[PDB]
Design a protein around this ligand. Sequence first.
Ligand SMILES: [Zn+2]
Lengths: 162, 100, 287, 208, 98, 99
Amino acid sequence: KKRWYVVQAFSGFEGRVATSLREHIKLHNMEDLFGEVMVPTEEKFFPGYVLVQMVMNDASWHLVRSVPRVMGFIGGTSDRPAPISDKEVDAIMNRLQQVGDKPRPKTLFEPGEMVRVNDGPFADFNGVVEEVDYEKSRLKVSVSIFGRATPVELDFSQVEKA
Amino acid sequence: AKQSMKAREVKRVALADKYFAKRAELKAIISDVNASDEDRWNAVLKLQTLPRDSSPSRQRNRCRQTGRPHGFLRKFGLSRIKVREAAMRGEIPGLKKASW
Amino acid sequence: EFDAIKIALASPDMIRSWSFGEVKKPETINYRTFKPERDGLFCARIFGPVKDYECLCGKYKRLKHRGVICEKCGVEVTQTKVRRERMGHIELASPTAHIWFLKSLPSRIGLLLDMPLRDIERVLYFESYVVIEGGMTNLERQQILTEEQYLDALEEFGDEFDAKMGAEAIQALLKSMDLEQECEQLREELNETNSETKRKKLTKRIKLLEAFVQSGNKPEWMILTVLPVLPPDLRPLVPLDGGRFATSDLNDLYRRVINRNNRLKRLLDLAAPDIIVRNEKRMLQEA
Amino acid sequence: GQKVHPNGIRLGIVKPWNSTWFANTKEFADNLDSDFKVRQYLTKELAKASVSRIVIERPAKSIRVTIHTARPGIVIGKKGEDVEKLRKVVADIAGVPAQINIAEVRKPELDAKLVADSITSQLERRVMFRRAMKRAVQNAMRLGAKGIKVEVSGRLGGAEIARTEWYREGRVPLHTLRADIDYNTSEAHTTYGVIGVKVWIFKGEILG
Amino acid sequence: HARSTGSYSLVTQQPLGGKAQFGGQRFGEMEVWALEAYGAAYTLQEMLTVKSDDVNGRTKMYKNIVDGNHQMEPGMPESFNVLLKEIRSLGINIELED
Amino acid sequence: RIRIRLKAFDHRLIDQATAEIVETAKRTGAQVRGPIPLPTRKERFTVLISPHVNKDARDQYEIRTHLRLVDIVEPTEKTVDALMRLDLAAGVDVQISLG
Ligand SMILES: [Zn+2]
């Protein structure tokens, strides 16, 4: 059974730390003592920490700290460093499965609320929706720029998301 | 008008707001020719159940300052009387005595 | 004009009364133009307008309406030396004890909470736990706890039990420290003993315990909760002969504290695990 | 009710409006109620302060009020101390980002609204109305008004039989449209009842 | 080198140092001791409030010198206000009573 | 091309706006279409003036909404943005539209 651990790297060289870590594993061929290496990313938490599926022998501990540009583990002590949890992994799994259930093409469009317009002449703007037809896919959203924001002729064309 | 009447108007406005959607849904059901009679029948019965003031037609346009029922104007929300006062004082933009 | 100069501790209400706006972003200036940052370290609304009686961005270019603040500028409208007297405050996400009252030799928090400096730092750098009014268990109030001491206690005294760490725990200890009560105890302890060493060790602790009660200084004012920032004019950002800005050292210090505080607020938003926010609060403490 | 309101009849030519904003029918009334509310608020607030004319003007989902007062200081109080307090309550009233400006009224003796109020105050504290009217007229002329007329009505001196009296001085041509006629009104709520005060102040003719 | 009135430094409103920068000579600490050692009190007051630091004090001084009225309006050193801001920027609450 | 609709109550104000906008267009870009004045809407209102009763006592007010149509044939990079910073006088609702 392999439990998780947290590694601190020089923040900014994190992908190179992950690649060098996989390569040190396949050099010193303790392949049965490492499962994965996680750097999670949103469209980047955590800012400088590398998650490692691992077991704890002192040989594998020296291996991970002999990987270059790695400071050390983060735990209660440096003798026996600390794994994190497992009860918060069940709730994190359901949140990771809902990372591609929507948040893309909500059936039609999304006018009426606040949005950032940015396309061609009328670019880098904003304004809330006050008129938009879904039958003809036409959005005459107010062109808020100099106070008087008269919804000019437009469509789900410049409709940003701001 | 009395205070009570206005309060009565407010309550009506709220109820109209509160029950706008469900009231609207019911009507569509009742209107729809392509709908079951028993479904229609339920809808109309359901409609009665709803609070009466919920209906928009119940609420009267009163003067926003005096609540005066008659002499209302939609453009200004004020009874003719107050409208003139505001107009003279210049409170109403662009409004002025007209001659043609 | 004025008699004596009075020095005392700074309450968080007193630091919010000094202040004119929370310094959020660590972004110093634009650096490619000439404008600052809205709203960063060198803000407009929090402090004042760079130019005298001018909205830096654009309105009031004469002497008529000194004060108006439009939404397009988010700027006050006063003198060029007005920023030198105005100071900002950084809302520290995690409590951080002062270094001047923790390492002064003797430490102010060392002879007040009856705890050795070594043990005080351990807990302060997220390396030891401290008990605070546990309850019906077999543990003292000053006695600390380790990972193994807490783990076993966690499974033992799962109910009424409190054992925090860091400045937060320390703050509580100080906050819940009846000054007056200690006085009598200490005074009675000094009159019921003959130990020379103890006498001097007790007279030095009671002296700083009764002196705190004589003034309006609270025990919870030792830990910094609302860190104050020095006026920009006093931490000047001038360029030397060339095209770069020779920046002061205090701007590096404040910009790191604000970078770390923003990271700690985001991690407490995201509900990161325990060891991540312990390292994050420890890096804020050291910052 | 013979005479036409002098201010209104001149709105097109010499007087400007007070509220100056554009709106379509949808948002028109609401603006008006908005304007009414705020003016009501300021008057209640700035009673002791001599305020003449509140000019509302709302561009871009933002109301810019412009207070004309004889003594701004009492309106401003400590620097930005009172005004700021007004602004926020205004915004609450308007429901939008508010902006208060304070235009200083030179020569309050020439502003009609101010004069009426001064008279009204004078009545409220039980002065001989006639003695009051004279002072308004004389002051106005002294300051150099081309002409002025003042009128009070009702229960003067608590008399059972209400009557109206008015003093004119200089020339106050009402039929001449291009005449700048500052007109305004007040009401003294005396123990003996309401006493209405009208006052015309003829600054002079405008040539366009 | 000689200086009547030149440029002033930015963080503490005192004159600049050196010759290439048109500066004034440092009235150091031992000279302050040597004027405490006499009874010269007004000389030291203008030597560290009017001539050096206080900006409104020195503009009042310059108007008073070019009008013939030898008189100083003292005020406060601005660098003492810098000391108040640096001590106050800690957790310390320094004030000025009365 | 950029269609711009100025609307206001005071005709003098609107004209001031229109001239102003043209200058912004003319300097940056070129081939400004022109300040084309559309028909004025004369929304009238009548009201009784007696507080209680005289159906013959009446005032008749109006609101003259004036229109101006300005178009820009060539939107240049410089021209379009120039308006961004270049706001107009209050109380004159503009309404821009490219295409
Ligand atoms: Zn401004």
